[PDB]
Amino acid sequence: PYLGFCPYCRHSAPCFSPIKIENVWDESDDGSIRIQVSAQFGYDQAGTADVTKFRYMSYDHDHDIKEDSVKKIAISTSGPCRRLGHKGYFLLAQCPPGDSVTVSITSGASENSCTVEKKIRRKFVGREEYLFPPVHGKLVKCHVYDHLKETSAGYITMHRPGPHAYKSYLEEASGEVYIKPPSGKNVTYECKCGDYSTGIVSTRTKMNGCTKAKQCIAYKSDQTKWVYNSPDLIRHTDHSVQGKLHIPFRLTPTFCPVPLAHTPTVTKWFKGITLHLTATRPTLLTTRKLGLRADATAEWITGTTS
Amino acid sequence: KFHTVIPSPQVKCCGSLECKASSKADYTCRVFGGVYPFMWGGAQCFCDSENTQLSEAYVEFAPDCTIDHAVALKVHTAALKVGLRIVYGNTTAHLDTF
Amino acid sequence: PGAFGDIQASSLDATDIVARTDIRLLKPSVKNIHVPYTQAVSGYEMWK
Amino acid sequence: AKCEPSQFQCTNGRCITLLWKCDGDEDCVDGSDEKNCVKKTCAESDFVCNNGQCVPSRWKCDGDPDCEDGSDESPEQC
Ligand SMILES: [Ca+2]
Ligand SMILES: [Ca+2]
C-alpha cells in the first residue's frame, strides 16, 4: 500500500495519485486486461483479506493506511468496464478497445484517478474477427485471464519501503529547524544540519547546526509493511527482496466460440476453382497447393466477393 | 514480451554511488547527480547539490509469457513415422512404423 | 534490440536471462522523483 | 539563460522552473522561490483547501472535488 506518481490524473496535470497503474497486460483472448496499481484491493488496513474493501496510502501529511469499498473503483477506457475480479495490487476487467486505460476512485469529492497512455485493442482469437462471440460456431482453443482471483499468473516482489520525508514534519521557528512529529509517531530524522546527523524522536525536537529546511528531512520507521518495487518510492538502503506476492488471474488455456461464415459456394472449372465468398467481418481465407511448391496464399476477405 | 523492470531508485544524497555490475538481463544502471528529488511528502535528500542518484533498469519475462512465449528450435534430419493398416485375405491388421 | 529474440533464456522460469534492448536511462529531468528511460519496442511483439 | 526548466536562473546559477516559483518549495541554494506571488487567502466565505486554492465552501459536501487537495471531502464536515 503506497503512493505513486502517474502521468495523468483527475486533473490534467501529473500527480502523486495514491492509485498508480504500474503495469498492464492484455494477452487475454477476451479483451480482459490485468492491471497492477499502487493500491491494494480485497484487504483491510490491518491486512486481513476482507474482499469487500480495499486500502491505499493516505494522501495527507500524516501517512497511514486508509480503507474504502471496492465498489468505488471504476476502470475505464473509451467507456466503463466490467470488473471481473480484484486482489491485492491487481485488478482484472473487460474493457472495450482504446488508446488509454484509466483507474479511478469515484468517491464523489474524493475522486482521484490514474491514466496510462497504453493502447488496448479489441483483439480476437480464431480466424474471423467478431464484435462479440456468436453461438452458431465452432469452439476453438484460446487463453483468457482466469476470473478466479486465487489463480496465480506469477509473482513480482516488494521491498521494505524506503524513507518518505514529509515537509510537514519540520518547522523553522527560532531560525533553526524543529522536528514536529505527529502525535505518538516514532519519527526518524536525518539532516546535514551543518554536518551529517540522524536520530529517532517520538516527540517535538529542536535541531542544531542549520537554519533552513533545505538540509533537513524527516520520516518514520514505517518499514512495518512492505511496498511494491515500483519507482515512485525510493528504495530502502537495503532493498533485498521481502518475499513475494502471487499475481492474480492466471492466464489459462480454455475454449472460445468463433463464427463460421456461410459455407463458401465453390464453383469448379478446368484446373481451377472459384470460391464464392460472403463474410460480414474480416475472414482469413488461406490456401496452399499440395505440390512441391506450396504456393502459400492468405487474404483477409471482407464482404461479398470471389 | 520483455517486461522492463526499473527498480526503485537509490540515492546517497551527499556522496558517491557505485555503478556496479549485475547478472540481470541488459542490466544497465547509471548514476546521475543533482537529482534533488521531491516525493509526495516533499524534498527527499540530505544535500542541496551533491545528491547523486542511481537509476536502474533490467528486463524479465512478463507474467503472461507462460502462455504468450515462443520457443525457437533448430530442427534437422526429420524421420517419417507412419500408421499402417494392412488388409490381406480374410485378415486385417493395423501397424505403426518409423 | 527491437527484433525477434529481444529477450532470451533457456527456460521461462529461469533467472538465467540474457537480453539486448537498447535500454538507456535519461537524467531525472523533473522535480518529482522519476526514472525516465526509453528502449526498443519489444522485438518479440514487433515480430508478432 | 534558457535551459532544461525553460525558465528563471536562481542566483546560485542553477536554472529553475518559474512554474515552481509560486509553489512554496525553495528549489535552489540562493534566491530559491522566495520572491512574491499572489495567494490572496480568501475570506472564509470560500474554503481554501490545503494548497491555499480558494473554493466556495458550499461545495465542501457536494460530491465533486473542488481542489486537487480533495480536502472538500473531509469526513468531519461531509
Ligand atoms: Ca518551487
Ligand atoms: Ca466539492
Identify the CA nearest to A254 among candidates A151, A153, A144: A144
Burial string for A38-51 (b: 16+ CB within 10 Å, else e) reads bbbbbbebeeeeee
Contact between residue B37 and residue C28 where contact means Cβ atoms under 8 Å apart:
yes
Helix (H) or strand (E) holding C43: helix C43-47
Is D25 in Cβ contact with C29 (below 8 Å)?
no
CA distance linking residue A201 with residue A184, whole number of Å = 10
Please tell me what resolution, in angstroms, this structure has: 4.0
Distance of CA A118 to the CA centre of its chain: 11
CA B37/CA B11 separation, integer angstroms: 9
- Least Cα distance to A8 among A81, A83, A109, A99 occurs for A99
The technique by which this structure was obtained is cryo-EM
Residue type, B23: S
A265: cell is: 459456394
Please state the separation of Cα D55 from the chain's center in Å. Answer: 13
A106 three-class SS: coil
What SS3 state is found at A247?
Answer: strand
CB burial of residue D11 (10 Å; 0-12, 13-18, 19+): exposed
Size of interface A-D (CB pairs under 8 A): 37
Which residue reads 484509466 in cell numbers? A102
- The whole-angstrom separation of Cα B76 and Cα A60 is 65
DSSP, collapsed to helix, strand or coil, labels residue C45 as helix
Residue A306 burial (CB count, 10 A): 11
Q: Are A138 and A258 in contact (CB under 8 A)?
A: yes
**Distance (Å, whole) CA A261 – CA B8:** 52
Contact criterion met (CB below 8 Å) for D33 and D26 = yes
- What whole-number distance in Å separates Cα of residue A189 and Cα of residue B90? 97
**Cβ-based neighbours of D22, under 8 Å, separated by 6 or more:** D33, D37, D39
Look up residue A292 and give its three cell numbers.
512441391
Q: Report how far residue A285's alpha carbon sits from residue A302's, in angstroms, rounded to the nearest whole number.
A: 10
Contacts of A67 (CB under 8 A, 6+ apart): A44, A45, A53, A54, A55
Q: Provide CB contacts within 8 A for D38, sequence distance 6+.
A: none
Q: How far is the CA of A108 from the centre of ligand 2 (A)?
A: 8
CA–CA distance, C31 with D3 (Å, rounded to integer): 14
CA max distance for chain B? 99
Proximal ligand: closest to the CA of D14: 1
DSSP state at residue D66:
S
Is the Cβ–Cβ distance between D78 and D64 less than 8 Å? no
- Using CA atoms, how far residue A163 sits from A171, A182, A292, in Å, is 19, 16, 69
D-contacting residues in B 27-66 (Cβ below 8 Å)? 36, 38, 42-43, 48-49
Residues 6+ apart with CB under 8 A from D78: A109, D60, D61, D72
Q: Name which of D26, D68, D73 is nearest A108 (Cβ-Cβ).
A: D73
Looking from the CA of A165 toward its CB, the CA atoms found within 13 Å total: 22
Closest CA to A3 of A12, A16, A21, A22: A16
Which residues of C have a CB under 8 Å from any CB of B?
A: 5-7, 9, 12, 15, 17-21, 23-25, 27-28, 31-35, 37, 39, 42, 44-45
End-to-end CA distance of chain B: 38
A interface mutation test: which of B3, B6, B8, B51 has the most A CBs within 10 A? B8
User: Which residue's entry shows cell 535519461?
Assistant: C26
Task: Please check whether residue A290 is in contact with residue A184, taking contact to mean a CB–CB distance below 8 angstroms.
Answer: no
Q: D25 and C31 in contact by Cβ < 8 A?
A: yes
Cell of B61: 519475462
